[PDB]
């Protein structure tokens, strides 16, 4: 039994890293799990509960792409009954384990891997009700995602709106929290590159200001590692003879900007140093 | 502004003898009757005259030259036939979205330029080969004629869009240089929001007896809309006030504006929690609905132009537009000629100053929420 | 970040007057000279000061408070004396593995919490009785002080690890509530990757004249690493190319990465079949490959469990990381070699623009 977890735990976990709905599904088949099948979504969710959002997402999809291949409608029925059993026990190691489990159920029902009026026919303990009210409201109305093994130019879409939205919200934390949520901390030059472009492409003074502020406060929240910040400017110091095709002026601007940056200390006298001109 | 010398009006897109495919496209796209400019400019273009249209920034206006470049394209000939210039990558891009949209049931081939991560790939496309319609900035385009990725040989329609803009972005030289590479034969359409000397003198040196359409039209002034501010000291007490309002006006249609996607989802689901069913916006099909079934809604602000707020009696600014210009885009709309209703501002202590600015920006008065 | 107010450096573990049994245990674990952090934070701890170390995520950051809680335990007194807090069960669990590891030749008794299939059995242990060192999440731990399965009476060392993490997992409340249960006497160590207001104000409300150690952060960087891709049309011809490479570079240390355990087993035993002895990867049977790689002696691991790869001159991606972020975790920080298929063609050009980096073809 406890010989169970000692076994699945390390494929569920391995999976959060190859991301293969499949490979998982094979290896379980060959373990020929019994009734104790319904103990696999429990293990999976409850692990992802201590993972990132990624893993949370990844799991919900594993719960789908596993149900009808190697798992009965009726495992998932109970697997969820156990998750509400253990909610008081789970919240010890994940405080928001209630609302979270809730979002799992919302989606569960949604991928149709779960019964329709399930919640309804589940009618002692705030923790489960709490977690059923989540699922309820969610439905009557992602986890969003998701980073890492996402498609590259998908990430770009996100970074784009991140920036686009910021320019109308004027909300810096708001930006940070989405850059942060994407989970691709080695891709942040994209954020920087995209952002410099907006300044390069804009007219009038707001773009420039608003992006120099965001880029300072990002550098300052150690959110943009000094390395990132540099692959950023290099991408720009690079494309500028091409960008100059869509924006004449782009030169005497991007350098006016590198100047603001240097002056604000976000970049070395030697990046500022390395800027092009003609 | 320019002196109009042509205004013959065409009521329906049906009387323009457009391809049927083109027709089907322009209805699927959502158009019904042709707009101000469409009733006046499409025909002249289609008929081949140089046209100089002084009109407000496109909807609409874009659809105009788009409909005529498409009506004129020789589907059969695989070589780039109409060349359109915009002031930004962004803006060239939307032009090509509209073209492809209307161009949907015809084999029309259209391409905007960039930009530049895979320019290598962009270029190998362009020749060869060979989009029928290419849109891009004057700089990009010209650099392309120079390199010969693009042939002027078959280009028979040359449209300059937002010329005032293009010139002032620094493109005068590149515009001329392109001119002198296109056939003395090429039709020229120049639309521009405004007609400064610069623009004029382009018109003056490149167009034959052109026809001058001037269906622009201004003000534009929120005198059909009662504007209020209800004072909520802290943002904490915003959600609270909202639902209080919801039952003391019990409105059945209202659009509530929010500054970020995240805060929409927040509010949306904090209100479903309270029994007030409400919609949030995001992709076209799942989106198309909310806009298809709209055509209580909480949207960002950005997609606000993805839905017509003018047939909505109540607009509520939960957040306040950081961009002043952008306020009117949310709330107002002038008075008949339609039209509208009222809109309500939730201002914080902090927001105190920020609203008094909106108030002098549009020389307008915003009174406090009554009873 | 935090302002350093203490940096005296200790070269050898020998000069820290650690127990000899503790000493034997830290050498046996693989350590040689003390790392950045170790030369700076061990003494202060051992000497009893509240210490607040801002340092990167543990390897031997873990070994640090581990070594000083063990140096301070009263082996003779059977009651739980040092309490350590981590942000996940997973992470508490490795802490106790490190502790047991170093603590091996002393009677040190250490336990992490869970989790819960046999919590019944976990509790009846805890008291009574009564581990010297207990590690666990702030939530679990506090729930156990409340139930009285755990006594604060003898706890004299209270270490909060990855505080920035814990706080943001939602544990601020359970952290304070524990504090107010431990003696006003308890030494406090808080290590944290980052030092946001939240974290600071904990430091500010629980520590006496605390010491601040800093430790400069070591960013991964594919800067000193030559990256190659050798083109192998089909995966069929992968194993083949591997062994060709094995003799045309005859490397003596190298890590080869694979995407699944199963395909590790495959490759390992298809290579032993070929006379190329080579290692594949549970803590004791594992601890070896990590104990013996660590102090030193071809390794083919998944990716998940991916040992300090930085002291390895050659990395080879047999499989390509499905998670782009995860690439730098394998290779970078040189050289490293990519085996790309026809299919994998596109997949690599992505890695290349992800980290704004260039990957050239295998030369001669």
Curated annotation (Swiss-Prot), chain A:
Domain MI: residue ranges: 3-123, 154-277
A GO CC term assigned to this protein in UniProt: nucleus
Subcellular location: Nucleus; Cytoplasm
Keyword presence, Acetylation: yes
Family affiliation: Belongs to the PDCD4 family.
Post-translational modification: Polyubiquitinated, leading to its proteasomal degradation. Rapidly degraded in response to mitogens. Phosphorylation of the phosphodegron promotes interaction with BTRC and proteasomal degradation.
Subunit structure: Interacts (via MI domains) with EIF4A1 and EIF4A2 (via N-terminal domain). Heterotrimer with EIF4A1; one molecule of PDCD4 binds two molecules of EIF4A1. Interacts with EIF4G1. May form a complex with EIF4A1 and EIF4G1. The interaction between PDCD4 and EIF4A1 interferes with the interaction between EIF4A1 and EIF4G. When phosphorylated, interacts with BTRC and FBXW11.
Signal peptide range in chain numbering: none
Related illness: Decreases benign tumor development and malignant progression.
Record-given protein name: Programmed cell death protein 4
Function: Inhibits translation initiation and cap-dependent translation. May excert its function by hindering the interaction between EIF4A1 and EIF4G. Inhibits the helicase activity of EIF4A. Modulates the activation of JUN kinase. Down-regulates the expression of MAP4K1, thus inhibiting events important in driving invasion, namely, MAPK85 activation and consequent JUN-dependent transcription. May play a role in apoptosis. Tumor suppressor. Inhibits tumor promoter-induced neoplastic transformation. Binds RNA.
UniProt keyword terms in alphabetical order: Acetylation, Apoptosis, Cytoplasm, Nucleus, Phosphoprotein, Repeat, RNA-binding, Tumor suppressor, Ubl conjugation
Swiss-Prot/TrEMBL GO biological process terms: apoptotic process; BMP signaling pathway; cellular response to lipopolysaccharide; negative regulation of cytokine production involved in inflammatory response; negative regulation of DNA-templated transcription; negative regulation of JUN kinase activity; negative regulation of myofibroblast differentiation; negative regulation of vascular associated smooth muscle cell differentiation
Top-level lineage group: Eukaryota
Tissue: Expressed ubiquitously. Highyly expressed in thymus and liver. Moderately expressed in brain, kidney and spleen; weakly in lung and heart. Expression is up- or down-regulated in response to apoptosis inducers. Regulated by many programmed cell death-inducing stimuli.
Molecular function in Gene Ontology: RNA binding
Range of the intact protein held here: 161 to 450 of 469
Phosphoserine: modified positions: 145
Comment field on protein domains: Binds EIF4A1 via both MI domains.
Swiss-Prot record, chain B:
GO BP terms: cytoplasmic translational initiation; positive regulation of transcription by RNA polymerase II; translational initiation
Activity regulation annotation text: Helicase activity and function in translation are inhibited by interaction with PDCD4.
PROSITE patterns: DEAD_ATP_HELICASE, HELICASE_ATP_BIND_1, HELICASE_CTER, Q_MOTIF
Record-level GO cellular component terms: cytoplasm; cytoplasmic stress granule; cytosol; eukaryotic translation initiation factor 4F complex; extracellular exosome; membrane; nuclear stress granule; perinuclear region of cytoplasm
Main location: cytoplasm
SMART domains: DEXDc, HELICc
Keywords carried by this UniProt record: Acetylation, ATP-binding, Cell membrane, Cytoplasm, Helicase, Host-virus interaction, Hydrolase, Initiation factor, Isopeptide bond, Membrane, Nucleotide-binding, Phosphoprotein, Protein biosynthesis, RNA-binding, Ubl conjugation
Helicase C-terminal domain span: 224-371
Reaction(s) catalysed (UniProt annotation): ATP + H2O = ADP + phosphate + H(+)
Assigned EC number: 3.6.4.13
Chain span(s) of sequence motif Q motif: 11-39
SUPFAM superfamilies given in the database record: P-loop containing nucleoside triphosphate hydrolases
Cross-link type Glycyl lysine isopeptide (Lys-Gly) (interchain with G-Cter in SUMO2), residue numbers: 125, 204, 217, 286, 340, 352
Domain spans labelled Helicase ATP-binding: 42-213
Modified residues (N6-acetyllysine): 97, 153, 172, 217
Signal sequence annotation: none
Assembly description: eIF4F is a multi-subunit complex, the composition of which varies with external and internal environmental conditions. It is composed of at least EIF4A, EIF4E and EIF4G1/EIF4G3. Interacts with PAIP1, EIF4E and UPF2. Found in a complex with XPO7, EIF4A1, ARHGAP1, VPS26A, VPS29, VPS35 and SFN. May interact with NOM1. Interacts with PDCD4; this interferes with the interaction between EIF4A and EIF4G. Interacts with RBM4. Interacts with DDX3X in an RNA-independent manner. (Microbial infection) Interacts with human cytomegalovirus/HHV-5 protein UL69.
Its job: ATP-dependent RNA helicase which is a subunit of the eIF4F complex involved in cap recognition and is required for mRNA binding to ribosome. In the current model of translation initiation, eIF4A unwinds RNA secondary structures in the 5'-UTR of mRNAs which is necessary to allow efficient binding of the small ribosomal subunit, and subsequent scanning for the initiator codon. As a result, promotes cell proliferation and growth.
Family that this chain belongs to: Belongs to the DEAD box helicase family. eIF4A subfamily.
Name of the protein in its database record: Eukaryotic initiation factor 4A-I
Designated gene of the protein: EIF4A1
């Amino acid at each position: 039994e406890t010989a169970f977890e000692k076994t699945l735990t390390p494929i569920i976990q391995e999976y959060f890293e190859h991301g293969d709905t499949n490979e998982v599904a094979e290896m379980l088949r060959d373990l020929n799990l019994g009734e104790m099948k319904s103990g696999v979504p429990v293990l999976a969710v409850s692990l992802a509960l201590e993972g990132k959002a990624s893993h949370r997402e990844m799991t919900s999809k594993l719960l789908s792409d596993l149900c009808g291949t190697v798992m009965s409608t009726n495992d998932v029925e109970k697997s969820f009954d156990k998750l509400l059993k253990d909610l008081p026990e789970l919240a010890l190691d994940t405080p928001r384990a209630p609302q979270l489990v809730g979002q799992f159920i919302a989606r569960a029902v949604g991928d149709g891997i779960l019964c329709n009026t399930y919640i309804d026919s589940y009618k002692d303990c705030v923790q489960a009700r709490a977690a059923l009210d989540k699922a309820t409201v969610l439905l009557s109305m992602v986890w969003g995602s998701g980073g890492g093994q996402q498609p590259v130019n998908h990430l770009v879409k996100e970074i784009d709106m991140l920036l686009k939205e910021y320019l109308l919200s004027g909300d810096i934390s708001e930006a940070e929290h989405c850059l942060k949520e994407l989970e691709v901390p080695h891709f942040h030059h994209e954020l920087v590159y995209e952002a410099i472009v907006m300044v390069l492409e804009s007219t009038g003074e707001s773009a420039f200001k608003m992006i120099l502020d965001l880029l300072k406060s990002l550098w300052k929240s150690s959110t943009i590692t000094i390395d990132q910040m540099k692959r950023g400017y290099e991408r720009i110091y690079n494309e500028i003879p091409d960008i100059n095709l869509d924006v004449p002026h782009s030169y005497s601007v991007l350098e006016r900007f590198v100047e603001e940056c240097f002056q604000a200390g976000i970049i070395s006298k030697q990046l500022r140093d390395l800027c092009p001109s003609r | 502004v320019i002196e109009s010398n042509w205004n013959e009006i065409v009521d329906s897109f049906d009387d323009m003898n457009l391809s049927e495919s083109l027709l089907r496209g322009i209805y699927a796209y959502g158009f019904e009757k042709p707009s101000a400019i469409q009733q006046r400019a499409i025909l002249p273009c289609i008929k081949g005259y140089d046209v100089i249209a002084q009109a407000q920034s496109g909807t609409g206006k874009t659809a105009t030259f788009a409909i005529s470049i498409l009506q004129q394209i020789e589907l059969d000939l695989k070589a780039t036939q109409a060349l359109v210039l915009a002031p930004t990558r962004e803006l060239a891009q939307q032009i090509q979205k509209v073209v492809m949209a209307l161009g949907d049931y015809m084999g029309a081939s259209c391409h905007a330029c960039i930009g530049g991560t895979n320019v290598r790939a962009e270029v190998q496309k362009l020749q060869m080969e060979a989009p029928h319609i290419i849109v891009g900035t004057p700089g990009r385009v010209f650099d392309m004629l120079n390199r010969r990725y693009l042939s002027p040989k078959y280009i028979k329609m040359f449209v300059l869009d937002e010329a005032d803009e293009m010139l002032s972005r620094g493109f005068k030289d590149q515009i001329y240089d392109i001119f002198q590479k296109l056939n003395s034969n090429t039709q020229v359409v120049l639309l521009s929001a405004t007609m400064p000397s610069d623009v004029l003198e382009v018109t003056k040196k490149f167009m034959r007896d052109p026809i001058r359409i001037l269906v622009k039209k201004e003000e534009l002034t929120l005198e059909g809309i009662r504007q209020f501010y209800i004072n909520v000291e802290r943002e904490e007490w915003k959600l609270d006030t909202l639902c209080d309002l919801y039952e003391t006006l019990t409105i059945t249609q209202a659009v509530i504006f929010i500054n970020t996607r995240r805060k929409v989802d927040w509010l949306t689901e904090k209100m479903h929690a309270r029994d007030f069913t409400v919609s949030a916006m995001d992709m076209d099909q799942k989106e198309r609905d909310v806009i298809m079934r709209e055509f209580v809604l909480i949207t960002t602000d950005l997609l606000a132009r993805g839905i017509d707020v003018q047939q909505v009696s109540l607009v509520i600014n939960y957040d306040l537009p950081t961009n002043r210009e952008n306020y009117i885009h949310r709330i107002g709309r002038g008075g008949r000629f339609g039209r509208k209703g009222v809109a309500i501002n939730m201002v914080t202590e902090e927001d105190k100053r920020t609203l008094r600015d909106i108030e002098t920006f549009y020389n307008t008065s915003i009174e406090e929420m009554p009873l």
